[PDB]
Symmetry: C3
Subunit: 155 residues, 3 copies
């Protein structure tokens, strides 16, 4: 069994909605990013690649490579996972922690878990997502951006 | 074995003391919160619920539900743990990282570990707590609030 | 198997280069610290000590003790590891996440992994390091300092 850790942040910018964990969440402002800026799935991906010792998302899919411009983060997630499985690993479980003052992630989590468990090919039971605010403190508390952390256990 | 991750932050406000990890730590200012604002135990709780795939603290015990107003975070911890055990899990071990510029958590950690190991019904050996400052950087470095991270391994 | 979590931050200050993960990385400004301010290895160390239930780096090697002034963080890492092994543990694997807007950690990671795997006496395969920016947000985004997180699994 191997453990992995990921972390990511994206700044708000433009018009909503935002895409977090695959779910299109309505919000006043949107997220600035090369990809779809899915903070939750980037953080999750790095955690998996991390536990597989494959580096990180920016190693496999370059921030600068133009093909990833607007790229569906679930696409990157599924590839990183394909590569991880090929290296001989199987999913233990993952846990995601979305750090955002707003929007309200709560109602979108079940669906977030459906997408992720799909992409990973596991039961939703091996996938957990939660959220927290930083009580108006920080760039997150000020609504400047969203951050997200994640851990994964591979077998 | 399952892994979990939690994270929490609370802003300073009012008169001291603060309650972290169950310990009443004396400090100039106190912590603003619905509950007792025990950042360390909230972070710990989410990590456990996270590894159990039960969501998070705000799911089980609503921030808005008035009964949790002033609620002893060890109470929430023990319940979340009861529910976790019922789902068939047993504690592997937990590790907490308190991120605060001040107060000095160090002298209070042994006692923090006694409370937590009690609430979890394990040996202190399966419970670790540590602290760190952010070197005067950030909302924590500026003494605006305390943050805390935690991980847990369930069996 | 035991899990551990570490976190650390150091403010920029003075002239470069910086030392991260053992690697001397060239940068305009340098890092302020008692030790060599190796954020990555401090974070890694706490994760290992954390999983071993030995506390944290500041417990074993006091910030105030003058001998650690300028201390090679790999030295502290190796000791904490010696002590950890003595307590009967063996390395499962570690994963580090350097949170910095700049400098570019990417090219230095292979070498970072060589040093760490050496100090831990494992194969590089049990050691992963990755990096991320906070998209110009926060003290990190503002180039005020570097932060780093890490997780470890002991056996
Ligand atoms: C999915 C993509 O957006 C591409 O489409 C990227 O792969 C990742 O984008 P991102 O989440 O915005 O992450 P970024 O903060 O821009 O950084 C990605 C890459 O830069 C490197 N990096 C980052 C920060 C830093 N101080 N030094 C670095 O070397 C890391 O190795 C990482 O692989
Ligand atoms: C223990 C309690 O205080 C109740 O007494 C709460 O359960 C938790 O309080 P807290 O530590 O201050 O955490 P909070 O930051 O206020 O958020 C709690 C809940 O809000 C949800 N949440 C939070 C932030 C966000 N952007 N979207 C969300 O949906 C999460 O699902 C979480 O369950
Ligand atoms: C390696 C050394 O620099 C010594 O040479 C230190 O061991 C660690 O230095 P550091 O990474 O800069 O970490 P610091 O943020 O200065 O804090 C170290 C110690 O202070 C304690 N601490 C920290 C913050 C806080 N609010 N309360 C505390 O009690 C912790 O128990 C930790 O062990
Ligand atoms: Zn991203
Ligand atoms: Zn809280
Ligand atoms: Zn340090």
């Amino acid at each position: 069994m191997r453990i992995g850790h990921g972390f990511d942040v994206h700044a708000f910018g433009g018009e909503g909605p935002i895409i977090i964990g695959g779910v299109r969440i309505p919000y006043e402002k949107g997220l600035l990013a090369h990809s779809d800026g899915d903070v939750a799935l980037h953080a999750l991906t790095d955690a998996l690649l991390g536990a597989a010792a494959l580096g990180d998302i920016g190693k496999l899919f370059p921030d600068t490579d133009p093909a990833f411009k607007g790229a569906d983060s679930r696409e990157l997630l599924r590839e990183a996972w394909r590569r991880i499985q090929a290296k001989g690993y199987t999913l233990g479980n993952v846990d995601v922690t979305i750090i955002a003052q707003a929007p309200k992630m709560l109602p979108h989590i079940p669906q977030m878990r459906v997408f992720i468990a799909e992409d990973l090919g596991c039961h939703m039971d091996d996938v957990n997502v939660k959220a927290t605010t930083t009580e108006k403190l920080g760039f997150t508390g000020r609504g400047e951006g969203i951050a997200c952390e994640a851990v994964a256990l591979l077998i």
